[PDB]
A = this chain, B = another copy of it.
C-alpha cells in the first residue's frame, strides 16, 4: 500500500541486473546502466499510480490476509502495470506530438534521446515487463494466464490507438502504397462523430489496460479461477470506467490547468474524436457545424480559438458535470451487482480517487 512506492528500486534493479549479465565489455555495461536507469526513473515515476494501487488493493481485499513474500509478487505485477503505462505514454507522446508529460519534457524530445531512441526504448520497457514477471512468478500457477492477460490487454490498446489516430483519415472514407509525398490535410468526417464509435475507441484504448488488466492480475494472483463468471462482470464494469475516465481526460484537454494536469491540451489541433466534439455536434446549430468542420484539426491558433469558444458557448462544462453524475451512478449500479464485498469496496474507493489519487 505504502509498500508499493518503496519497492520500485527493487524491481528496477532486478531488471538492470539482468542487463548486467550480458556478454559486453565493462565500459559499455556501465554506459548501458546509466541510460536504462534514467529511462526507468524518468518515465515510471511522477504519476498518480492509480493502476498499480488497484492491483495491490484488489489483491488484499479478495483475500483473508498475506506474507511479505506474497506481497513481493503483488507489487511486482503492480510495477509492471506502471511500466506498461510508462511505455504507452512515451509512445503516445510521439504519436500525438506531445510537449510536456508529468510536468517535464516528453522523452522523445530530449536531444540525447530523439525519436530513434524513443521508439527503441518503448519496446525495451515493454519487454522488461515480461522479464520481471518471469523473475517473480515463473513458478506460480497463474504465470501463463498473467502473461496472457498483459498480451491481450496490450493488443486491444494497440487497436485502440489505431482508431484514435485514423478514424478521420482518407483511409476510412484502398490504401495507396505509392504515395510517399502528398499528405492529407486533416478534416473531420461527420459519419464518425457519434458516441457509438467514440465508445469503441475509448474502451479499447483505455478500458482494458487501465481497469481490466490490473483487476484481473490481482484476482489471478489471489488464486481465483480464470473460468469463473465474475470476470465477465468485471469486464463490463471496466468498460464503464474507461468511458468515464477517458471523457474526463478529454474534458481536461480543454479546461484543465496544464500545470495541474502536467500536460498540454492538443486534441483539437491533432484532429481527435473527443467527447466535447461529439456533445457540441449533437447540441449545436447548422451554422456552427459548418464552423466546426472548417476549423477543427487545423494547427492554427485562430481556428483552435473558434472551437474552444463554441465549447464555451454551448456550456460544455455544465454538460460534463451532468454526464459525470449520471455515469458514476451507472457505474455504482454495476459494482453492486458483483456480490463481492471486498472488490466492491476497492472499486468504490477507486471511483473516488480516480481524479485526485493517493
- Write the residues of chain A forming the contact surface with B, with a CB cutoff of 8 angstroms: 18-19, 22-25, 28, 31-32, 34-35, 38, 42, 91, 94-95, 104-105, 109-117, 119-120, 122-124, 126-127, 130-131, 134, 143-144, 147-148, 151-152, 154-156, 158-159, 161-163, 165-166, 169-172, 174-184, 196-197, 200, 203-204
State how many copies of this chain the complex holds. 2
Chain B residues within 8 Å of A147, by CB? 147
How many angstroms between the C-alpha atoms of A300 and B329 in the bound complex? 63
B110 touches A175 (CB 8 A): yes
A116 touches B104 (CB 8 A): no
Given contacts A123-B126, A180-B105, contact A131 B110 (CB under 8 A): no
**Shortest beta-carbon distance from A279 to chain B in Å:** 19
Chain B residues within 8 Å of A131, by CB? 151-152, 155
Chain B residues within 8 Å of A23, by CB? 200, 203
Chain B residues within 8 Å of A111, by CB? 176, 179-184
**Shortest beta-carbon distance from A141 to chain B in Å:** 12
Chain B residues within 8 Å of A165, by CB? 116-117, 120
B24 touches A200 (CB 8 A): yes
B105 touches A178 (CB 8 A): yes
Grouping DSSP codes into helix (H, G, I), strand (E, B) and loop, the A interface class, with mixed when no group exceeds half, is: helix
Chain B residues within 8 Å of A31, by CB? 171-172
Chain B residues within 8 Å of A156, by CB? 22
Chain B residues within 8 Å of A183, by CB? 111, 114
How many angstroms between the C-alpha atoms of A179 and B105 in the bound complex? 9
Chain B residues within 8 Å of A200, by CB? 23-25, 28
How many angstroms between the C-alpha atoms of A17 and B204 in the bound complex? 17
A91 touches B123 (CB 8 A): yes
Chain B residues within 8 Å of A203, by CB? 23
How many angstroms between the C-alpha atoms of A61 and B122 in the bound complex? 38
**Shortest beta-carbon distance from A119 to chain B in Å:** 6
Given contacts A110-B180, A130-B151, A179-B110, contact A120 B28 (CB under 8 A): no
17 A-B contacts, Cβ less than 8 Å apart? A23-B200, A25-B196, A35-B162, A35-B166, A35-B175, A91-B123, A110-B175, A111-B184, A112-B179, A112-B184, A117-B162, A119-B122, A120-B162, A124-B155, A124-B162, A127-B151, A131-B152
Chain B residues within 8 Å of A94, by CB? 115-116, 119
